[PDB]
Design a protein around this ligand. Structure first.
Ligand SMILES: CN(C(=O)[C@H](Cc1c[nH]cn1)NC(=O)OCc1ccccc1)[C@@H](Cc1ccccc1)C(=O)N[C@@H](Cc1ccc(O)cc1)C(=O)O
Ligand SMILES: [Ca+2]
Ligand SMILES: [Zn+2]
Lengths: 324, 306
């Protein structure tokens, strides 16, 4: 079960992609308005890919800093958009943007810390928000937020680690919660988490690495779990996860690059889900990131853990050791 | 035509969204908000803030209404949730809403929730949200790991796409025998698994589970386990004869020989890696690293000599 691939693009089109992201959001558009519930993360994706392509300056810094500030609530969490509700997901994204722009002081950093700390449970897990949903995704959002802010000690780190290790499975992988099946997305979040907290020694790298490299299909794309179709975003999580645990060479890299490039729209710019499907900023980020992790020299090197330029992270003195 | 139906919905979406927020800042936690959110959440259950609003109105209304009236309110929430789940079965917010709802009631019907799960799992045997919902309900109803196990068996024989079901067995077996895998249990699981992979040799899911089982138990090899593994080895070669492009039975042959006797089977193991790399060239780097790790183990074993 894979995509048979047609006569798709085989060339890197930085050009169109930048044009696509600088113009995305000009305001009557349909999928734009339907996406308001994730706008903050939408803005993170746009800013990051542009910066990785060296075109951050074509985006509107001052405008975004107001927006962010207007999305922090009295609890200190940040929402996706104005009037929407605070959540760990949009708090991480705002901090990534503020770190991209060197402007963390645009929000009340003490209140962000308190907010993240208030979402931790007795067993070490994190809820996403006051409504209580538990997911190792939110373990990743909490520790990644705090690390960017230098405040990782604000949470109970040992109980947080314990919970994540309790979500490890027979195949080496990780799920949402205890007992949940392994999935590429959850693996990325958990290996990221273990990276930030210096616990990669607890991962069975050979076992998990095998599971991850078996995600690559004969088309060259990676899927997020068995029996699934490959795509660009699961291609980024799998690869990033492999890089974190020192096993990126267990994939056929030239076949992955080609899949990723077959995913560009030659006419509109941006990347899609999979070849010839409709483009979006989410897959545009993760395609450019994927290509950067495979080595492409037109793209700035990208952190597998934080999905941001390394040169940004070198500046804030946060750079987790990975396996080899 | 294309633009006709497209624009038309987007007007009515923006009006509804607009009115809900207006209502909310105005403090109007009433049935009008459930009606407006009903409209938006059906098309887009990933709009989390609106699940929040619904909880907010229900919490409030419970304090202005008779238990009968709020009973009625939760039953309509349950039906609303199911109609949303039919449309988009994989939305985190919809499934989280349902647990919030059920966790809160005086006397939920958990047997009927387990059956909602059996229904969605017959639609989509791989749906991870439904499997997580099922484990949640099993817990709340204090369902024994023994019957969850009987349920997993049914799902595997009746049809394939079983990764989800073997995974659940990986977690249920250890619960049947609390330790800080018994050989009898292990031998049983080995027989079920090889069954499965000599039935659909291209189902990758039983092979993954199998490799775990090969680990899960040396030579403390009993004659029975010794004879069972030797038999599994001969069966994989026969399957190899039939399916020469089958990469999974080739790895398993290697892994089985490791489990049996690394040094006795050194030549064959080496033979099998070249064959395997030729059928699965995308894993050539993985296979070289595995073969290097094993040749190193073979070096340590040969040293322990006289
Ligand atoms: C939940 N999800 C996502 O893609 C979401 C998208 C989102 C919406 N709002 C904010 N993000 N990602 C997510 O929840 O965050 C995890 C995360 C956050 C930061 C850094 C790494 C991972 C994935 C699964 C997943 C699980 C764990 C980690 C990562 C992904 C998902 O359900 N995808 C769906 C459809 C989909 C596809 C794209 C989206 O943006 C949202 C949903 C599918 O493929 O069927
Ligand atoms: Ca600018
Ligand atoms: Zn995708």
């Amino acid at each position: 079960d894979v995509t048979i691939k047609s006569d798709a693009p085989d060339t890197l089109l930085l050009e169109k992609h930048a044009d696509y992201i600088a113009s995305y959001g000009s305001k009557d558009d349909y999928e734009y308005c339907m996406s308001e519930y994730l706008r903050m993360s939408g803005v993170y994706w746009g800013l990051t890919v542009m910066d990785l392509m060296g075109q951050l300056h074509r985006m509107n810094k001052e405008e975004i800093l107001v927006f962010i500030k207007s999305c922090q609530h009295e609890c200190g969490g940040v929402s996706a958009s104005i009037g929407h509700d605070p959540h760990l997901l949009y708090t991480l994204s705002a901090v990534q943007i503020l770190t991209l722009y060197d402007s963390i002081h645009v929000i009340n950093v003490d209140k962000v810390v308190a907010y993240v700390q208030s979402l931790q449970k007795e067993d070490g897990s994190f809820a996403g928000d006051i409504w209580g949903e538990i997911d190792t995704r939110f373990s990743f959002c909490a520790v990644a937020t705090l690390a960017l802010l230098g405040k990782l000690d604000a949470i109970n780190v040992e109980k947080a680690i314990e919970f994540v290790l309790s979500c490890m499975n027979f195949d080496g992988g990780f799920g949402c919660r205890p007992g949940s099946e392994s999935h590429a997305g959850q693996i990325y979040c958990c290996t990221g988490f273990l990276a930030i907290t210096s616990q990669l020694h607890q991962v069975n790298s050979d076992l998990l690495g095998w599971w991850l490299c078996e995600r690559q299909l004969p088309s060259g794309g990676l899927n997020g779990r068995p029996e699934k179709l490959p795509d660009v975003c699961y291609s980024w999580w799998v690869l990033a996860s492999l890089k974190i645990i020192g096993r990126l060479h267990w994939i056929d890299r030239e076949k992955l690059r080609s899949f990723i490039l077959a995913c560009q729209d030659e006419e509109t710019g941006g990347f899609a889900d999979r070849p010839g499907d409709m483009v979006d900023p989410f897959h545009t980020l993760f395609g450019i990131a994927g290509l950067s992790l495979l080595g492409e020299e037109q793209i700035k090197p990208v952190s597998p853990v934080f999905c941001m330029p390394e040169e940004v992270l070198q500046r804030v003195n946060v750079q987790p050791e990975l396996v080899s | 035509a294309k633009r006709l139906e497209r624009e038309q919905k987007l007007k009515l979406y923006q009006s509804a969204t607009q009115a809900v927020f207006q209502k909310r800042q105005a403090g109007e936690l009433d049935e009008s908000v459930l009606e407006l959110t009903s409209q938006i959440l059906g098309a887009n259950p990933d709009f989390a803030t609106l699940w929040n609003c619904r909880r907010e109105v229900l919490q409030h209304l419970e304090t202005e209404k008779s238990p009968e009236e709020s009973a009625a309110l939760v039953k309509a929430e349950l039906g609303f949730l199911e109609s949303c789940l039919r449309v988009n079965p994989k939305s985190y917010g919809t499934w989280h809403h349902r647990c919030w709802l059920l966790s809160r009631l005086p006397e939920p019907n958990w047997a009927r929730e387990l059956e909602l799960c059996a229904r969605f799992l017959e639609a989509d045997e791989r749906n991870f949200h439904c499997w997580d919902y099922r484990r949640f309900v099993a817990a709340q109803a204090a369902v024994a790991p023994a019957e969850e196990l009987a349920f997993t068996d049914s799902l595997i024989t009746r049809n394939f796409s079983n990764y989800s079901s073997w995974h659940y067995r990986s977690c249920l077996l250890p619960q049947l025998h609390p330790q800080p895998l018994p050989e009898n249990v292990l031998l049983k699981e080995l027989e079920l698994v090889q069954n499965a992979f000599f039935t659909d040799p291209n189902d990758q899911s039983a092979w993954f589970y199998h490799r775990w089982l090969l680990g899960a138990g040396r030579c403390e090899l009993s004659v029975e386990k010794s004879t069972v593994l030797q038999s599994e080895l001969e069966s994989c070669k026969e399957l190899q004869e039939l399916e020469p492009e089958n990469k999974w039975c080739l790895l398993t042959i290697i892994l089985l020989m490791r489990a049996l006797d690394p040094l006795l089977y050194e030549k064959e193991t080496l033979q099998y890696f070249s064959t395997l790399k030729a059928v699965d060239p995308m894993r050539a780097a993985y296979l070289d690293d595995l073969r290097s790790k094993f040749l190193l183990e073979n070096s340590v074993l040969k040293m322990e000599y006289a």
